[PDB]
Design a protein around this ligand. Structure first.
Ligand code: NAD
Ligand code: NAD
Ligand code: SKM
Ligand code: CL
Ligand code: CL
Lengths: 288, 289
C-alpha cells in the first residue's frame, strides 16, 4: 500500500543558490529520475556566501553524488572542490558538481546548454559571427563554449561595471586558446553596436535585462539595428518573450528564448551524475 | 497536470543520520504522512557515523533544515553539536530527534515517550505502579528514564553482566537522584529476585534484542509460572510480531503488546515537533501493513 517512491535507499542531488525556491530544476530532474526508474530525489537549498563553505563540507560528509550551483555561488565554489573540468577552469564558474569516490569535480553546463539549444532549433552559428551582451557567468560560459565549438568571431558588449574586467579576461582567453576572434566594447557605444550586429548572424542577450527587475526593458537602443534575417536570442525565459525578443519578432526576426538552454544545461548535468541521457523530449513536453 | 512529482524547489528536507540505516522504514512513515497531509517536506536517510557527524550537523545548520532524526552510532554524541536539550534528552544522555528554530538546535528523545504513549493507547495504565524491565541499551535506558519522569513508582531493571551493566547502574543513580521513582538493578541470572519483581509489577517488559534475530525463538523469561493473568507483558521487538516471550505470556493469560506502537508513536512525536501538525497514526499503521 506504499505509494511514496522515497525510502531509506533514496539518494539526494542538491541545488544550492539564493533565491532559488521558485526554480524549475527540481521538477525537471525529479521527473527524469522517475521516468528512468532511478532512486534519486533533487532538492533546492537557500545557500549564499555565508553558507556555501559549510554546505559543501556537509555534502562531502553526506556523500552526495552531486548538485547544481546557481547565483550567488557559481564563481566562488571552486575553492571548495578538488578538480575542475577544462571548461569550468576556463570560464571561472561552476554550475554542476560530481562526487567520484570523494573527489569533487566542478563542471559548467550553461554554455554547452546554450549552444545545444541553438543547434536543436536549427540555428547554425559555427564558423560565423555572434554579438553578445554580458560578461557574468552565463555570458562567459556561452562565449567560451562558442569559441571552443568553432564560432568564428564574437563581439562582446557590456556596461562599465564590475564585470567589464571579466570580459577583458574572456577576450584574452578566447584569442590565445582558440581559433575564434573576440573583442569587447562598451554597451553604450551604439555606433559600434550597430556595426557588430549588422555583421553578425546572431545577437544574444546574456544579461538580466528583460527579466525582473528589468522586465519590459532592453539594452537594444533601436529596433532598426535588427534586420529580418538576424537570429535574436535571449538567455531569459521568464518572461517567455523579453522586450528584446518582442522587438525582434516585430522586425521579422527568428527568435529563441532561454528555455532550451535551461533544458540542455540540465540534461548535461543529469548525464554527468547518472551516466544516462535525460529523456529531453519527455521533459520538454511536461515542463517547458 | 502533466507534472506528477510532488517535489519542487519549495520542498523542505527532514533527515535521518545513522549507519547502517538505508533499510529503515522511517522515511516511508514520514513521507507517507507528509503526502497524506499535503505538507511540502520529504524525509531522507544519510549514512553518517562518528567521522561525519560534526560536518553533517554544521552542514544541516547551513542548509537550514527544519530537523532530523538521529540513530546509532550518533545518539549519545550529538548533544556536543546542539544548542539545547529537552529534559529527558539531557537526563538520558541521548538524542534521537533534532529541531531547528532560527538557527538554534534543540535535541529531543522520543523513543521513551513513544513507548509510554503506545501503552496508554492500548489501555494500559502503568503510572504510579511498578515496572520490571530487561535491558540497559538505548531503548531500555530511554524507556526507564521516561517512565520515571512520567510517574511510574518503581522500576526494577534486569541485565546480564556485559558491557551495558554499568550503564544500567548509571540509569539507577539518575532515576533515584532526579525523580521520586524507586529504581534498582539485578543480574538477569537472579531468577528468585526476578520472580519477586514480576509478581509485584503491573508490567514486565523486554527491551533487549532477545526474541529478534539473531535470537529469534529465544527468551530471557526463566519460568512461565512467574507470569499471571493480570500482568501486562510488553516487548520492544515487533519483527517478529510475537516473540517467544509474548507467546508464553499469551499462554499464561496475560495482556500483551509488541513494539509496533512504540515505533509509530515515537514517529508521531517527532512529526509534531517538526511540522506542528498531528501525524495520522492509524493511516500510517495501515499503509505499513
Ligand atoms: N536559460 C538558462 O538556463 C540560464 C542559465 C544561466 C543564467 N541565465 C540567466 O542569465 C542572466 C545572467 O545570469 P548570470 O549568472 O550571468 O548573472 P551575473 O550576475 O553573473 O552577470 C550579470 C550580467 O548582466 C549585466 N547586467 C546586469 N544588470 C544590468 C543592467 N541593468 N544593465 C546592463 N547590464 C546589466 C552585467 O553587466 C553582467 O554582464 C540571468 O537572467 C539568468 O537568469 C539563464
Ligand atoms: N519498537 C521500537 O520502536 C524500538 C525502538 C528501539 C529499539 N527497538 C529494539 O530494541 C532492542 C534493543 O535495542 P537497543 O537499541 O536498546 O540495543 P542495544 O545494543 O543498545 O542494547 C542491547 C541490550 O540487550 C542486551 N542483550 C543483548 N543480547 C543479549 C542476550 N543474548 N542475553 C541477554 N541480554 C542481551 C544487552 O545487555 C543490552 O541490555 C532491539 O531489538 C531493537 O530492534 C525497538
Ligand atoms: O535556477 C536554476 O535551477 C538553475 C539556474 C542556472 O543557473 C543553472 O546553471 C543551474 O544549474 C540551475
Ligand atoms: Cl542512456
Ligand atoms: Cl547511538
Amino acid at each position: 500500500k506504499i505509494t511514496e517512491r522515497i525510502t531509506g535507499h533514496t539518494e539526494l542531488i542538491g541545488l544550492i543558490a539564493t533565491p532559488i525556491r521558485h526554480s524549475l530544476s527540481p521538477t525537471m530532474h525529479n521527473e527524469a529520475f522517475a521516468k528512468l526508474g532511478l532512486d534519486y530525489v533533487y532538492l533546492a537549498f537557500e545557500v549564499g556566501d555565508k553558507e556555501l563553505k559549510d554546505v559543501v563540507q556537509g555534502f562531502r560528509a553526506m556523500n552526495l553524488r552531486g548538485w547544481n550551483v546557481s547565483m550567488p555561488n557559481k564563481t566562488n565554489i571552486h575553492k571548495y572542490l578538488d578538480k575542475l573540468s577544462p571548461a569550468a577552469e576556463l570560464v571561472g564558474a561552476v554550475n554542476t558538481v560530481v562526487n567520484d569516490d570523494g573527489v569533487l569535480t566542478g563542471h559548467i553546463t550553461d554554455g554547452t546548454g546554450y549552444m545545444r539549444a541553438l543547434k536543436e532549433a536549427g540555428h547554425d552559428i559555427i564558423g560565423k559571427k555572434m554579438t553578445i551582451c554580458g560578461a557574468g557567468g552565463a555570458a562567459t560560459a556561452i562565449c567560451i563554449q562558442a569559441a571552443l565549438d568553432g564560432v568564428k568571431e564574437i563581439s562582446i558588449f557590456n556596461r562599465k561595471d564590475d564585470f567589464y574586467a571579466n570580459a577583458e579576461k574572456t577576450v584574452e582567453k578566447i584569442n590565445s586558446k582558440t581559433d575564434c576572434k573576440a573583442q569587447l566594447f562598451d554597451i553604450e557605444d551604439h555606433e559600434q553596436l550597430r556595426k557588430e550586429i549588422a555583421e553578425s548572424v546572431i545577437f544574444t542577450n546574456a544579461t538580466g535585462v528583460g527579466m525582473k527587475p528589468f522586465e519590459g526593458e532592453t539594452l537594444l537602443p533601436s529596433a532598426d539595428m535588427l534586420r529580418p534575417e538576424l537570429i535574436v536570442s535571449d538567455v531569459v525565459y521568464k518572461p517567455t518573450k523579453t522586450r528584446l525578443l518582442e522587438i525582434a519578432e516585430e522586425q521579422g526576426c527568428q527568435t529563441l528564448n532561454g528555455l532550451g538552454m535551461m533544458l540542455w544545461q540540465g540534461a548535461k548535468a543529469f548525464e554527468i551524475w547518472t551516466h544516462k541521457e535525460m529523456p529531453v523530449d519527455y521533459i520538454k513536453e511536461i515542463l517547458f
